[PDB]
Amino acid sequence: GLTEEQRMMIRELMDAQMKTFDTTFSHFKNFRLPGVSREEAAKWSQVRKDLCSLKVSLQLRGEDGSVWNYKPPADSGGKEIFSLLPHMADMSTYMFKGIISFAKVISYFRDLPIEDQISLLKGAAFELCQLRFNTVFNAETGTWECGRLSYCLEDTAGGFQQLLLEPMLKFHYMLKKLQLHEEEYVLMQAISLFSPDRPGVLQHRVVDQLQEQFAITLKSYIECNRPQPAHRFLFLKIMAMLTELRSINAQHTQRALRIQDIHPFATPLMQELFGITSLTERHKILHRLLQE
């Protein structure tokens, strides 16, 4: 029931995903690990709220069968809250490079002006990273299973219902429950990537038309490949998750900027994406990664 252009569109996205998603995280190496006034204090209090929402332990399984586990320190009003930030900055940077490589493989993305490519990746990188993370998220154990690395949500005092208050966690549980196919995830990534309303986009009409083509392909994929009645509104559920993910993106970017102000953690590539200091001149790494 899909057109050939739709089947080819999905094949290119799946090809790009296969080439650029290290699902085992086997090439994520050389990462850092936690070591073995008035307004300023206001800033610190807000940052403590930002970091407290997402608290995870880190597990490292060795080739020999050994297991290293890191339990995060409780908040005592000090830099210890930033213990896992160097590690997460390396993980985010690794994931961002994989997202950049994903976009570059796609013909519809490569044929765009390079400044639109920069603007689209700047606005969507976090979203595509979370979409990839959802495919390794274990909702039964609350753990992102990243090959030999695992990030396990810490039992907060409150239980699931307390975790669901955090939009990012509620997003992963709700998306995982839809039990999407690989093809549906990669179409979600394309719809997010080709968002015409991203800051700094100039060819809005071209991107909007490309986004509609992917959305129609996703809508048609669901109609043709899922039991018609029960999945009647699955496409709309997916689109609603994408709108919520864009909101979570804006919130996390503001959290990152607040943490960066008081306690620098972002890598040079992360600084370009977050706007930390011509689109190309303000994004030289991203420009190099796109032109190679």
Next chain:
Amino acid sequence: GLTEEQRMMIRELMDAQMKTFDTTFSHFKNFRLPGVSREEAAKWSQVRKDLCSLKVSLQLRGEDGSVWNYKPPADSGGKEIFSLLPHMADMSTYMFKGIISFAKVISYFRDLPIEDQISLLKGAAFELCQLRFNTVFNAETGTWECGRLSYCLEDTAGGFQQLLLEPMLKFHYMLKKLQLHEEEYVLMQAISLFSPDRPGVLQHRVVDQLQEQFAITLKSYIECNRPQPAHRFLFLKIMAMLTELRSINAQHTQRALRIQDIHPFATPLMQELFGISLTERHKILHRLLQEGS
């Protein structure tokens, strides 16, 4: 009930213990960590039994409140059995240095010839280290609580009964059950240290006379401070434990040499202790004994 000299003897030992036992292990730093032929097989078979008997997980608690935990690999037949050996060699070396400093500050020891000081430390270092380790051993949890570092015995089939088969573990459980005071531990250290029949000792009479006075002081200390029935025969029980500890020392030295043969792990100071002129054969220990405390 103690003589004035006995009261002075215990005070000097306790003072020496306080100055040289880093009970919080706060100065134990820069240590290694696990990374993130028929006859030759019989050698490996024996070593696998030696390492499996003493199997522990490691906790590294940070000042910030963070906890790193290392679970050892299961034995699948390979050099995985040696994952924690570099770390344990660094911990043993640090404990040995504390023992050397303990002996150096004691007047009865520093006035001995340096060759005998080398021989006494060579024969007693492991024993005094185990006695200090017993004071941080948690028998309820099977964990040596070394300040920010914890070494928890791994569970095995058979439970406590299987662990007690290992003489080293049985020693720690039996000694902990005696509920000794600090003064009794430090007198045990002195009795072990001033053992006249250690290899290489020359002033046997001087060392034996020193050992007898520490034992007499220990017996008198117990007589004055432990009326309870539970502590009947405590002095004789302690002396029997010290004889057992000397046997375990000989057993551990042979284990270390077997493990060293297959998979080298010993630090230079450990090699000097395990090796068989005294000054030329123990250059680090010689230097440490000449330095100030």
